[PDB]
Amino acid sequence: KRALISLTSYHGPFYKDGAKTGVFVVEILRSFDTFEKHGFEVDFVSETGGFGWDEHYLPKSFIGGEDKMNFETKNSAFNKALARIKTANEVNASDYKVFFASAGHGALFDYPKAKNLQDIASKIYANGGVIAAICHGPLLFDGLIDIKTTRPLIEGKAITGFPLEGEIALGVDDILRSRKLTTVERVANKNGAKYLAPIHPWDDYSITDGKLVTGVNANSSYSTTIRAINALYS
Amino acid sequence: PKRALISLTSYHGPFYKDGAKTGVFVVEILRSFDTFEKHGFEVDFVSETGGFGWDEHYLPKSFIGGEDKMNFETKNSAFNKALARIKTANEVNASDYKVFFASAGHGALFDYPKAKNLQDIASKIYANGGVIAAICHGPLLFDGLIDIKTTRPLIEGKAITGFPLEGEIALGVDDILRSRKLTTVERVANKNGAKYLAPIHPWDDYSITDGKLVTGVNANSSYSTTIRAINALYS
């Protein structure tokens, strides 16, 4: 039983104050821990094999509980996997039964064009596995193809993910226009899917539609991981 | 100024193996009424017959507390005044209301799929640009609910949630659904061309907004569903 968590590989500029974006560490900590407590062996991966933390969301500023210890303990299960982070094109998809797409505002840049991660995810899904994605993670769905039909994998599906209202609240909706970046909702409509919104951008909100599982944010990471595990055995 | 209509199940007869009668789950109407009122909506109640009864496994005294208890037990509270004024469905003018809210309880299994007057009110409210909301077994009212613009079932092409079969199994009433040939929300969704999206647990606060069609799983979802219903009205 193996799960594969993808990270955004982009960690360049984004924010107006010069600070760089990247991975939101809370997302992968919660997901990694939940998988491994439920009998899965987890590996990390990105399109390039590299990544960085969003600079407005530095680990020590946001991490709490026992995943704070997991991050800081150098020899932990989380750190052994993170140091072993794989490069997408080198990954054998048949090793994994669950694909989990973690995010951060970096996913706005690489995920829609991450052809190798998409290849991995679409193959896992083809063999009867689960594709899961949280926050900006569903951006990986843009260009994600059903091997059999050649149509978008998420066509006719219901998904959730980070809402436009969340970006406005964060004051980054202008950056989306400036840097020609998209939203999960746009990706949904572009690919024949329906987008379902949470009441608030910070809510723990999740959707299971067959073996395609989505969540709104890091606060939804645990629930989306549980949904992914349940979906695999459905 | 702005008015909401909360429907109750009409049925309060036999259901459980221990001889207990089913009916309304009071927490559903108490919580939705309050949330509507606190947001400036005047609220009226309705059922298909004009009558109702509390589910005997969920008697109010055994399940209410705080200002829910207060609102229920205070003789001239806004909740009690509206409940004593419960309307009969065929007498209701649909154009008065901007939101239809179907509360439930296992009683909904018996009358809701065939409550043609309630179905008429809801469709008209929907046609006039209003919102349809439903929690728990409430979405059973959607069975054969016609969109006047399409001629087809209103929930066709829509995403909904509601009380899962998993919930009936945990409650040990799933065998009663087979004996008495009663349905589930999931089965109503698939029969009317809708997609059913399940909660992780049958007791979760879980709700969906799809345009102006709003659904929740249970009483723990009634607040969130009412909020979603209000929000959807101005969408």
PDB file of N, CA and C in Angstrom, chain B residues 2 4 24 58 65 93 96 131 191 204:
ATOM      1  N   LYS B   2     -38.615  39.819   3.656  1.00  0.00           N
ATOM      2  CA  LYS B   2     -38.156  38.571   3.043  1.00  0.00           C
ATOM      3  C   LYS B   2     -38.682  37.403   3.854  1.00  0.00           C
ATOM      4  N   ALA B   4     -39.293  33.060   4.393  1.00  0.00           N
ATOM      5  CA  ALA B   4     -38.827  31.694   4.180  1.00  0.00           C
ATOM      6  C   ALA B   4     -39.913  30.708   4.590  1.00  0.00           C
ATOM      7  N   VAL B  24     -41.259  14.098  12.677  1.00  0.00           N
ATOM      8  CA  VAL B  24     -40.330  15.222  12.590  1.00  0.00           C
ATOM      9  C   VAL B  24     -39.214  15.100  13.628  1.00  0.00           C
ATOM     10  N   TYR B  58     -36.979  10.517  18.982  1.00  0.00           N
ATOM     11  CA  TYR B  58     -36.326  11.821  19.066  1.00  0.00           C
ATOM     12  C   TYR B  58     -37.267  12.876  19.643  1.00  0.00           C
ATOM     13  N   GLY B  65     -31.614  21.688  24.163  1.00  0.00           N
ATOM     14  CA  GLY B  65     -30.987  22.418  25.263  1.00  0.00           C
ATOM     15  C   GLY B  65     -30.723  23.868  24.902  1.00  0.00           C
ATOM     16  N   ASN B  93     -49.575  30.386  -0.789  1.00  0.00           N
ATOM     17  CA  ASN B  93     -49.203  31.160  -1.971  1.00  0.00           C
ATOM     18  C   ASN B  93     -47.681  31.207  -2.103  1.00  0.00           C
ATOM     19  N   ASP B  96     -45.059  34.419  -2.143  1.00  0.00           N
ATOM     20  CA  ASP B  96     -44.735  35.119  -0.899  1.00  0.00           C
ATOM     21  C   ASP B  96     -43.323  34.810  -0.387  1.00  0.00           C
ATOM     22  N   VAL B 131     -34.666  30.046  -3.751  1.00  0.00           N
ATOM     23  CA  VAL B 131     -33.794  28.937  -3.356  1.00  0.00           C
ATOM     24  C   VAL B 131     -34.576  27.746  -2.805  1.00  0.00           C
ATOM     25  N   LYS B 191     -32.194   8.414  -9.644  1.00  0.00           N
ATOM     26  CA  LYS B 191     -33.467   8.260 -10.358  1.00  0.00           C
ATOM     27  C   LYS B 191     -33.872   9.535 -11.109  1.00  0.00           C
ATOM     28  N   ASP B 204     -21.802  14.021  10.291  1.00  0.00           N
ATOM     29  CA  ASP B 204     -21.049  15.239   9.952  1.00  0.00           C
ATOM     30  C   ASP B 204     -21.944  16.422   9.600  1.00  0.00           C
TER      31      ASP B 204
END
